[PDB]
């Protein structure tokens, strides 16, 4: 038996879908800043596209030890070209922004239901997104001090390239 | 400048995006064998759609490798049923050859144009993919003898639970 | 189901059958060299008939990789004496020639029916064969060199019988 | 010189033969089971079939040994199907104990000539023997067990698959 | 016997000798950065040149291997000068396409002679081009970058100093 | 600014364009003993062409560390056929003497200027050309003990062929 609710499990199953959507854009940047021959952010990029993957997982074994089940629907095409570095790590940043929003939404609406283990299983995320949008404010913040500066950039491609 | 052909990039652009459906309908499998109960299944599933990852990242690097750049298309929403465990594992041979015959289509083309270094990066997955056949042809010809014992399928079930 | 054609998988057949041959062709080499006491010769002629099994199985894994099965068919006999050391070798180097002949046959033969698999599959032993064929080029070599100066021989005998 | 009689040395040389001709029975039987897909049953035969070299060869060096030589006949071609495991097993059982009653006639042709090396030399073979009957009779009376029970046959299948 | 025809031998001595070349080449390059005072760049150029002889004896042995012979031809003069870093690397990488060029036309021949043992060995260096073009199109891409901007210069310097 | 006088910094280029020549020399007569079946000679003169090789890099680092540069010059078709095994080795004393004399010649001008800094440079190239001048000799030696007996060359072939 399925002790979600069918409401929360779609809620749930939706944000699986928007987690696997989160990687997909992320090595969509990538894609953008391998062209643009920064392989230090497309590495930056392919990490964090792999870290949306271990969150994807993270709902869906919650979603089966509540009994209930996955449902992958298509992935939409993500952009695939920004207009600079600061414009790719800006939609980062409101990307995460707006998984953040998503996840609070099925917070409200799991505690409005009383179904206190989903809450308490989201507390991992509301934690983990603080962290996500900050890791992409403190990238924007060097970015602007650097100021199209390819000596600072050259070395923040460095830097970061060294995600592990 | 690109020194791949434009439909040479096409080509592996678009087997790349295969890569990536091909990950995404194993991990379809997994929700399916994990809604069965079968965890062991499942997980070879998942291991298996791990590896696909991996084979679009190798289109991925040998693009940008010659020149070319990624686009990242929409990936389709896969089957989440099947009827029964063997089902499942003949559609996943099904999908393998399919898979075989897209490269096939490549290397023929690479070959015609004469793009010598894209018809030797394309040795790799032809034997690739006889192994990946292998594999499922031999899960298949066990659960054809099996005859649906349960027995045998739960032996089946942590023996593939077990994959590295 | 067999994913190599009835032809194809003949072809494949055909050399491993002749690939056992290889190797009791040899050690007929080793029965002769082993009675007129060049216990050297003879060690050298029992690893290259361990070595001809291993092309044997070889292809066995492969033909059943691909779905089809083997059958074993009845061994000729072959040469038990030869007129002296350099005309069992050169013996050798004829037969090798000549199953690098029939290895490119069957190259030629799944190129023509666009079996990529076993092209690629075949690539293996068009390389030793290279290497095999180099072997007795060169052992001949230092037999013309030698000429028959027991002194020598006691050397090349010594040598050979090293081999691992 | 030769200080075995003729007599004794072409009853050596047949068996000599005749261990080559058991090697490629059990690699025949390799080929059926293969082909059945009990890749366990198919191992134990490709051991035992260089285990059946392995006696060839003493029988190589034992003739070396007394001054005789060696002559390797053509070898007949195996039977390739059998109607199930157990009568594969069977046939195997009833080849050891031919081979058995073959070392016996020369033991006791040895014996009659005074032979006195020869019969101790086929000590070996004979205590041997004994272990290859009996490992194949424990073999059969597990199959007889097992009665056609598909879930036992795997468990048969995959210990044998472990033989060293 | 040489087994390659003279055709296929005097491309692949014609190409080793063009390896020799390539080596000289990246001296002379070296020996032009390091009259800039770029260690690091002349030190890369250093290491490249024992690459090329790399390439060089390879060809040699496979020469001597399908029973031909190597004629060392004499070393034309390379270029002493360029304008520039860029312009330099631009030169390296004319050269290393035209090199891939050279070694595609020697794999068409022997295709077109069914030389299949040239064919497999040259597969390779078509390999390894697509690692020596990118390389050198990658260091072109950071010079474009950095724009003559010396602060990011000394930063590509001592990091093409550390090739190993 | 350059601390050499230029008669001497061309007197040093001319020295390291011909150690650049003598291994292509010692890799011309390595493409003979290869073409005579020595391997192990061939591979003595492989290993001294690399040595050679070290020698023009001593004179390339000298004339940078005194404000020189190096100028590389077309290098001449040597040789590739002697009468024999002593032939190519008398050869190559005679190569070796010649060398000692023209080190010789730029010591004598180094001294003439009072190029101190240069004389000092030159005397490990003096040392080292007794040196390398003995282990001519001591080979020749080798050779002329062995007095054309197979037997020996063998050994002397095998010996040489350890060269690390
Ligand atoms: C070099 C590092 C490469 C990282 C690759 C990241 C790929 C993420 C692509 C997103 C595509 C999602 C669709 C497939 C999902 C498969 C999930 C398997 C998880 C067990
Ligand atoms: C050193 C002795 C070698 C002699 C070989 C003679 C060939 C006769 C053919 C007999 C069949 C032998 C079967 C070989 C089985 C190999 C199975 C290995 C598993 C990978
Ligand atoms: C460590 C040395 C630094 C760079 C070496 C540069 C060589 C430049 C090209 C030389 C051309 C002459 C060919 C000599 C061949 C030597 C063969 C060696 C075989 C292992
Ligand atoms: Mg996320
Ligand atoms: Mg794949
Ligand atoms: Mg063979
Ligand atoms: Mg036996
Ligand atoms: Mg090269
Ligand atoms: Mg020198």
Redesign the interface.
């Known amino acids: 038996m399925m002790v979600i609710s069918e409401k929360v499990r779609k809620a749930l199953n939706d944000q699986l879908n928007r987690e696997?959507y989160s990687s997909?854009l992320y090595?969509?940047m990538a894609?953008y800043f391998?062209?643009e021959?920064f392989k230090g952010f497309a590495h930056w990029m392919?990490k964090q596209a792999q870290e949306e993957l271990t969150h994807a997982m993270k709902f869906?074994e919650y979603i089966?030890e509540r009994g209930g089940?996955?449902?992958?629907?298509?992935?939409?095409?993500?952009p695939?070209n920004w207009n600079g570095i600061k414009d790719a790590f800006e939609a980062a940043l409101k990307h995460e922004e707006f998984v953040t929003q998503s996840i609070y939404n099925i917070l409200e609406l799991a505690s409005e239901e009383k179904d206190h283990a989903t809450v308490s299983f989201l507390k991992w995320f509301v934690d983990e997104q603080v962290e996500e949008e900050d890791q992409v404010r403190e990238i924007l913040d060097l970015l602007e001090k650097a100021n199209g500066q390819?000596?600072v950039i050259?070395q923040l491609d460095r830097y970061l390239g060294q995600r592990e």
Chains 1, 2, 3, 4, 5, 6 share one sequence.
């Open positions: 696997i997909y090595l969509s894609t391998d062209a021959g392919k869906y089966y089940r996955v449902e992958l629907e298509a992935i939409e095409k993500p695939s390819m000596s050259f």
